[PDB]
Amino acid sequence: VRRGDFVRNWQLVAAVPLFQKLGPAVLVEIVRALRARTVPAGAVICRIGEPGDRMFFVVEGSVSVATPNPVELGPGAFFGEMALISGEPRSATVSAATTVSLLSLHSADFQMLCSSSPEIAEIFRKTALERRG
Amino acid sequence: VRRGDFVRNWQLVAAVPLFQKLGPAVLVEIVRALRARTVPAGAVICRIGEPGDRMFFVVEGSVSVATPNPVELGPGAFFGEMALISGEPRSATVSAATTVSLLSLHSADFQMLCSSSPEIAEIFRKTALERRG
Ligand SMILES: Nc1ncnc2c1ncn2[C@@H]1O[C@@H]2COP(=O)(O)O[C@H]2[C@H]1O
Ligand SMILES: Nc1ncnc2c1ncn2[C@@H]1O[C@@H]2COP(=O)(O)O[C@H]2[C@H]1O
Ligand SMILES: [Br-]
Ligand SMILES: [Br-]
Ligand SMILES: [Br-]
Ligand SMILES: [Br-]
Ligand SMILES: [Br-]
Ligand SMILES: [Br-]
Ligand SMILES: [Br-]
Ligand SMILES: [Br-]
Ligand SMILES: [Br-]
Ligand SMILES: [Br-]
Ligand SMILES: [Br-]
Ligand SMILES: [Br-]
Ligand SMILES: [Br-]
Ligand SMILES: [Br-]
Ligand SMILES: [Br-]
Ligand SMILES: [Br-]
């Protein structure tokens, strides 16, 4: 973990209220695991039918989930959780509605997060069910 | 270590250039140990001749060291290190020149920082030496 990326992540995680449920020790683990990325408007982040090995948190800007009736997800939202939970391919294509700042979490670290915080794990599980059905 | 105080310290620490010399592991150590406090304009932070068991880093505003020819210390500066280095009482009264935002580091944590960072330990010693007499 490089200093620059580490320090920058603290500013970025502040835009994701969900992480307010994590104590200091857990926050550090997550900050060390998260990867920051900026995606230009229009780019495809997750493509329907493809294998998924990571999930994302929106920091700034918004993404569009290409469901029959598209769903725009904004700052603080997360996506790409379904493939990690179910093991199934991406359920829908997600693209940048506007230029978007994201924080990504690989599967191994997603598992760590869920075990470190059962409450956050429940939010992921229930939200995925809402989206699934 | 309060969750709120912990997350709040990251942006406060960013205002102190000295800490740019610290890596992730040590940054977490200092963020956990530092105590944030605001001091109103004119108030005494440490009084000459009094025992000292902590030092301070200025985040916002400025303080005034009451040496024969007063010395102003603005954002990023530190003071109160001499009592920690020498074991002697405060060498001068330091007061808030304007309302000031500070980060306090207790003796035990100051020792930890010096062990964790030889470069910073040297800066403290050299600075204290230069300021003394
Ligand atoms: N109905 C829906 N509403 C909002 N987001 C959805 C919906 N269906 C899928 N998504 C998201 O888009 C992602 C596609 O990848 P995943 O299947 O891994 O996880 C998905 C969710 O995060
Ligand atoms: N000449 C000086 N210039 C800048 N700061 C000083 C000077 N003399 C004392 N100080 C500071 O004011 C503090 C008074 O407390 P300390 O003696 O513990 O440590 C001191 C320094 O941080
Ligand atoms: Br920790
Ligand atoms: Br992906
Ligand atoms: Br699911
Ligand atoms: Br990732
Ligand atoms: Br990524
Ligand atoms: Br910083
Ligand atoms: Br380190
Ligand atoms: Br750590
Ligand atoms: Br204190
Ligand atoms: Br005053
Ligand atoms: Br006061
Ligand atoms: Br008094
Ligand atoms: Br004091
Ligand atoms: Br200022
Ligand atoms: Br000294
Ligand atoms: Br005086």
Curated annotation (Swiss-Prot), chains A, B:
**Compartments (UniProt record):** Cell membrane
Query: Which cysteine pairs are covalently linked by disulfides here?
Result: none
Superkingdom of origin organism: Bacteria
Cytoplasmic topological segments: 1-133
Residues that bind 3',5'-cyclic AMP, according to the entry? Answer: G80, E81, R90, S91, R131
The free-text function statement in the UniProt record for this protein reads: Cyclic nucleotide-regulated potassium channel activated by cAMP.
Q: How does it assemble?
A: Homotetramer.
User: To which protein family does this belong?
Assistant: Belongs to the potassium channel family.
Designated name of the protein: Cyclic nucleotide-gated potassium channel mll3241
Per the UniProt record, the lineage of the source organism begins with: Bacteria, Pseudomonadati, Pseudomonadota, Alphaproteobacteria, Hyphomicrobiales
